[PDB]
Amino acid sequence: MVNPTVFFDIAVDGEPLGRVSFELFADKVPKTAENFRALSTGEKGFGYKGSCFHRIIPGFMCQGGDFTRHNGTGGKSIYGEKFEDENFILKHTGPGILSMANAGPNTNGSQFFICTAKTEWLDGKHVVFGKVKEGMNIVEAMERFGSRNGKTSKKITIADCGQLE
């Protein structure tokens, strides 16, 4: 199939929470789907595995992907550094939407967020490249460790990740 599926095994302070899987719309945003896929499998020697969700805001989104600096001010793509906003064809239509967390136009590295709500004002600013296939209840579980500014009350990590089938 054209669109790949990836999984995250989420852990809370080391204790397993559960698995979230994603469908990646490589048919709409190939370069952005590919970046996320390869970083999930770890085939480049680096990627999401072991990284944490550093910014979680209840009712808004869960943010992760900063495997270098861990704090929002880091991360890098499989293209070396930061790549362009591929397109904004797809919209933030509800919970489960997987989108690129940039720091401006054409600043895509490795950081992403999963929406826990409809975030319409993000359309045209952030690239949508996937959606939760299974485990939205795990994401809802994650956002319970969030806060108003994003500071997580517990260490939320990607214990393991990869591509499925």
Partner: protein, 145 residues
């Protein structure tokens, strides 16, 4: 400035036209000499980046100096960015961005946003930061003339 209105809440009061005219007068008669600096500071207390830009753009006829001041501001704005890396993420409702140098300078920031950064516990004093960049540019052109 950002003042208490008739109802007690912190609001954007525009700048007084007579204070603007006073500034224009100072620069028209004195030009950009050492004396123009204490005056600018005195007439810009509490000013937003937009108010500070209104004061600068009202100076009708000092082209070379204004280009010199602008470059100095742009340098300070570039230094700010270099010293202030941005945290990636979507901005939630309720809060706003970390200001970039262009925001502190008022070129990529609405008055609403500047008021937001200023009226914050604890704040990003974008008016006071920008004013410092302007005072440095003034000192430069004040020693040129």
């Amino acid at each position: 400035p950002i003042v208490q209105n008739l109802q007690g809440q912190m609001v954007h009061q525009a700048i007084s036209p007579r204070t603007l005219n006073a500034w224009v007068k100072v620069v028209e008669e004195k030009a950009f000499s050492p004396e123009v600096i204490p005056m600018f500071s005195a007439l810009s207390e509490g000013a937003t980046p937009q108010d500070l830009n209104t004061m600068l753009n009202t100076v009708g006829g000092h082209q070379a100096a204004m280009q010199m001041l602008k470059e100095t501001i742009n340098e300070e704005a570039a230094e700010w960015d270099r010293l202030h890396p941005v945290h990636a993420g979507p901005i939630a409702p309720g809060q706003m961005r970390e200001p970039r140098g262009s925001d502190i300078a008022g070129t990529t920031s609405t008055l609403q946003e500047q008021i937001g950064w200023m009226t914050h516990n604890p704040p990003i004093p974008v008016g006071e930061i920008y004013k410092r960049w302007i005072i440095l540019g003034l000192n430069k052109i004040v020693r040129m003339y």
